[model samples]
Target: NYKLPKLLYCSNGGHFLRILPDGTVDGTRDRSDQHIQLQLSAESVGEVYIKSTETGQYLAMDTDGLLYGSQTPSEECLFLERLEENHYNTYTSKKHAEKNWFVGLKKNGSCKRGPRTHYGQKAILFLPLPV
Candidate 1:
């Protein structure tokens, strides 16, 4: 286990509570009543760091100067289109050129939040098959 020598401060006035060799705060209890807890690990704590910007909000940053907002989702989706299907053939044909264009498919009836909208129409770019 690792230990914190002393409290560290950020340019924005944020504080990193000092830790002890046993992976515990010097005078703090390891209980639910405590506001924060710092844990020690044998491995180097990767490169990303997270800081609280406000109550219930946070800001993330990396040593490489990359900064991230606090509104990121807990789960994300990656989509890939299948091009070997007959639906792709009928959709790409010149006969249906006007109606076969890309369209937007919204996840919710209203655009309240989240990146849930998807392209309704299929395109050659979305095809996952090799020519």
Candidate 2:
């Protein structure tokens, strides 16, 4: 058993979180977008890095917990993976809270850290595919 690639699809939109070339993080419905490909790495302790398989960047957080693609791994990219949560894997950023709040989208559809809850439409995960 080991860390694996995941296809993080939202339940409502069926879109996938994507990492852009300039380090911007977004979502798309196109399955062919390599930028949308993410791998969950549990190689480190107490946290996991949501890394891009295509660009090797981490899904990191800015000051306000906004999503970005990072080359230099930092605590901002660190996330605590919650199993059996969100129907799969739910992620909570260690950037904003002591252990609360989940990384999600704002009312405008932009991404950021929000209060702890299992109701976020964008705070979703994947139930890994077959090896």
Candidate 3:
């Protein structure tokens, strides 16, 4: 089954901007917003999902890769490696309740598929929602 991950955020109402598969902001209707300037080089626009947490929200990648989330949707997104059990626990406990979460890149054009890469190589982005 192809399951999509959830993107989590910390604060409430705000504009969540993400570069789409076409290298454009996924749902932006305005072309003048400076926040949507990032570009993604993925083969296609990866799925972006959001899950609500007690404190904020979370974002994941294709439901199988690295995960990124932030306190405020537009704040510095945190990268979670698959094996980082400590970080995962802290993130999940504080924000989500060990439920489903989505994933995606930090910036549109920052993600690349490879092995043994560090946090800098993962994609981090924003997930907008009410806190």
Candidate 4:
């Protein structure tokens, strides 16, 4: 495929994000199951589809901001990639940005709900690396 795999590193959690075999998404310190491919939108700049190379599932968040993996793409699977002032990146739910839904990982390497997250939080910051 033309899409390159990348690791989404969460410094606050000291881990990389991964989509599990059960279709759950989380952060883990382990080296395995961390590959993600960012699919850029052809029609919109900054819009992207986050897919797990291991599970072949798309990263998705419900309207309530619960993170999960989707078998097929949808509006809930779309994210707006933004480069923050700190040089880290944030993936905000493109369909729910007005409601402040963001992809985040807690300090304990757990998933953070969208309602409890903000762009300024280290838990919400992610650095992308080529895998």
Please report the candidate that would top lDDT against the real structure.
Answer: 4
The candidate with the higher lDDT, 1 or 4, is: 4
Ranking by lDDT: 4, 2, 3, 1
Once model 3 is optimally superposed onto the true structure by TM-score, how far is the C-alpha of residue 122 displaced, in angstroms? 8.6
lDDT of 1 at 44: 24
Residue-wise lDDT of candidate 3 within 2-105, one digit each (tens)? Answer: 13322222111222333443222232333344334322112112322233222234333323333333334332233222323222211211122233232322
**What lDDT is obtained when candidate 3 is compared to the true structure?**
0.29
Looking at candidate 3, the ten consecutive residues that score lowest on lDDT are: 88-97
Question: What TM-score does each of the candidates earn?
Answer: 0.17, 0.77, 0.20, 0.88
When sorted by TM-score, best at the front, the candidate numbers are 4, 2, 3, 1
Model 2 spans with C-alpha error above 4 angstroms: 43-46, 105-131
Instruction: Please give the CA lDDT of all the candidate structures.
Output: 0.22, 0.66, 0.29, 0.80
Ten residues in sequence with the least summed lDDT for candidate 4:
34-43
Model 2, position 111: C-alpha lDDT score: 56
Give the Å error, residue 42, model 2.
Answer: 0.7
Candidate 2 local Cα displacement, residue 81, angstroms:
0.7
Worst 10 residues of 2 by lDDT: 122-131
After superposition, candidate 4 runs with Cα above 4 Å error = 34-43
Between prediction 2 and prediction 3, the one with superior TM-score is: 2
List per-candidate RMSD values in Å: 21.5, 3.2, 14.0, 2.4
